[PDB]
């Protein structure tokens, strides 16, 4: 939780592998789990928690502005992607090997087809516009998803 | 003239025109809307 920025409160280990992220898909296809509209990724890659929260804030602000009164709060968002992998880094003027560096942030590994956000309680046009607004905060190619 | 990578129509009087192999946005109403891709 922790309000806006999403990462684990604690982890079993502090320092993780780099891993490989350029591959991976959903082998059975993807369907929305909670909402009527959604954003899924088209590529596989890494998303920082700051980028996920920027996209969520863009969707929330667009729903807050485009709708007013009683339907302003009736738009609901689900965040299906969670940055649970810590990344580390080393400072400048430091030579190569004296152990792993200190953790610097959190990332989420995304596969092809993986649903990132889900939306309900809004119109289709507002869902499309919020999906367009959220895609500019993300370094991966995304697509608008509709329940059918 | 506004020079940017993402040129847009920003009103109903904005037309896209291609001149000398370059994309321009011309506007009969608002001269602030005049753009060149680059």
């Amino acid at each position: 939780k922790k309000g806006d920025v999403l990462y684990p409160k604690r982890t079993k280990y502090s320092k993780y592998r780099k891993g490989r992220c350029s591959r991976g898909c959903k082998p059975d296809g993807t369907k929305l789990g909670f909402g009527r509209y959604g954003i899924k990724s088209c590529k596989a890659g890494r998303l920082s928690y700051r980028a996920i929260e920027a996209a969520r804030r863009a969707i929330i602000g667009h729903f807050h502005r485009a709708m007013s009164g009683q339907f302003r709060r009736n738009g609901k968002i689900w965040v299906r992607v969670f940055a649970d992998l810590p990344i580390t880094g080393k400072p400048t003027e430091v030579r190569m090997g004296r152990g792993k560096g200190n953790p610097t942030g959190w990332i989420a590994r995304v596969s092809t087809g993986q649903i990132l956000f889900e939306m309900d309680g809004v119109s289709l046009a507002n869902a499309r516009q919020a999906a367009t607004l959220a895609a500019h905060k993300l370094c991966l190619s995304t697509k608008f998803v509709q329940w059918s | 003239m506004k020079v940017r990578s993402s040129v847009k129509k920003m009103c109903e009087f904005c037309k896209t025109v291609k001149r000398r192999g370059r994309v321009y946005v011309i506007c009969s109403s608002n001269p602030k809307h005049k753009q060149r891709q680059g």
């Binding site: 959903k26 059975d28 296809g29 369907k31 899924k40 088209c42 009164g69 009683q70 009736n74 309680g121 | -």
Partner: protein
Amino acid sequence: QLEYLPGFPRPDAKHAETILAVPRSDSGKNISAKERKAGRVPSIIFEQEDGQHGGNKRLVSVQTNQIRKLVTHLGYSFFLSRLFDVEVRSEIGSDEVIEKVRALPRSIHLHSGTDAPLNVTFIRAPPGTLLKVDIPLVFIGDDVSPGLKKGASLNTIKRTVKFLCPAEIVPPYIEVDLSLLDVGQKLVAGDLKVHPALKLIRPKDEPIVKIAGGRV
């Protein structure tokens, strides 16, 4: 008594096309890729009876354009809850009809990124066959409901409900009327109006929809 009751939705005549298929000589990723390069979706026609030893299976290929058009026009869930006529010919535009069957599309695999069709599965449904079908829900009367007039929001908990259905009277959708719903109370799966020959597979105490309290 194996007919759709009056006042209940029936499958639409507009989407009652015949799905055209040609036989397929093999299975695997190689021939599937070669078929998708030729504009066809690999498929299979089988039946319930001998699930071991295959189901009297016939391997076929269907056109990508027809499958894509049907899935786009109907919707994903509406495609999977509606019977179709499947015609199998020796080649595209021939006359040697190999099989003409009334089958339910049991599953369809769309690509996770591009949503192109990769596989369509048809199960033979002659009259008197009982199939487990996920029927999509259509919610009407939300503009009449007192709960949503007061500014409360709709929590749609389920979009499809699983039913054991005789093949004759599989509903294309179930209309859920929300008009007598004010703030707080909910509908369960037992509140859905169906044919008496349809059986709920999941328990009747499963919430379908709930009008939750709007923020004062």
